[PDB]
Amino acid sequence: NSNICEVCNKWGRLFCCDTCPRSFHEHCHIPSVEANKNPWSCIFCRIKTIQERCPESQSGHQESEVLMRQMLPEEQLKCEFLLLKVYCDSKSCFFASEPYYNREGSQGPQKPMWLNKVKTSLNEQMYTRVEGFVQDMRLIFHNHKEFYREDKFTRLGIQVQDIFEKNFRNIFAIQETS
Template identity: 45%
Template sequence: MLFMNMLEQGTTTKCILSQDGTWFTPREFEIEGGYQKSSNWKTSLRCGGKTLKCLMEAGIIRTLPGKGGKKKKLGNSDICEICQYGENLFCCDTCLKFFHGDCHLPPVEPKRSPWSCTFCRMKASSRSQQCLRESEVLARQMGPEEQLKCDFLLLELYCHSESKEAVPPGCLNLETVECMKDLLMLNEIKKKLSERGYPKVEGFVQAVRHIFQVHRASKTCNNFCWGIRLEAKFEQHFKEVFAVQETKQEHTNYKIKLEKDA
């Protein structure tokens, strides 16, 4: 399995995961496959039947970072808050945390100065708000405030799913690998959210919940797996961020719907 967001951090990043849980750089994977004499892994490695070179030229995989750019000068310990990898990062002028331009939501605008990340903007906008029923929250139009909150919720999922709760490379078991496969669907939601593709809060929340429903129905899912824990975090954060005052009947209806979908 090729993790494109990892590959895009640089050629020395271990971004290819084998069935036995071993991680490889592109060159290491090329050697493992018996192509140690190859002079260009971009043409010898294929993903979905296409060479990586073709995928890069088509824009499916971003061009690997070079040494130039207008990014902040970094120390050796500086890493992206979302993916936990370094190189070519932008620094939030408020909290001084680092982010890749496309890891962040919304994508970082390089010319914007000063620039504050979504986490800092959420803190600045946090204030006492009226508690609403979940049905009322879901029916709200996706205005600037709602967009900010949804960006924040998705970034929180990425932080937990790709770094802080991840099992170190080389120690992955089958359940964790399957969870990672299911959660890659988050990338589709991220793309649509960044393009302002959800007219209402309901569309975004339903899309995220659908991913967890699909995962819950998989053979490798159990009550203690990574995906289930991540789902619980999302539901908790959703209620906190939108000040949801859930009624007992709404909670019952939601549980019945999940059981039917599963």
């Protein structure tokens, strides 16, 4: 196994996957590393199994159809994995915890949103369709763009949004386009 967490790239108290060489801090894995279960298989491995069981699941899809899917167990997992892929980028630090807004010339968003809030909402099964999860993820970055206006810090929102969107297209096998 690796000797650093796959998500935050730090050492510490790590749980090792039985079917691949990745390792995780307990609360870095999503869902949080399960208490018992020997063997244990990480989210990467679980996602690969879905693909392997249904190879056709990698054929192109329309985003509109994906968003209307109900949050059954496999879509729950996919959203968990997509959230984890965002936390994998160090720039997610800026969007992890609850923000506050006091900048001359700007007003805070009407509906603040942050990664840990999305993580809790997934854990508590609050989303009934993929659309709910995707809307809250895109809201994170849209709120940031609007608030930071012409400050160069706006770029951090563009950057992390691009990681989300690339991963969304990959995990949900969105049909490639020009």
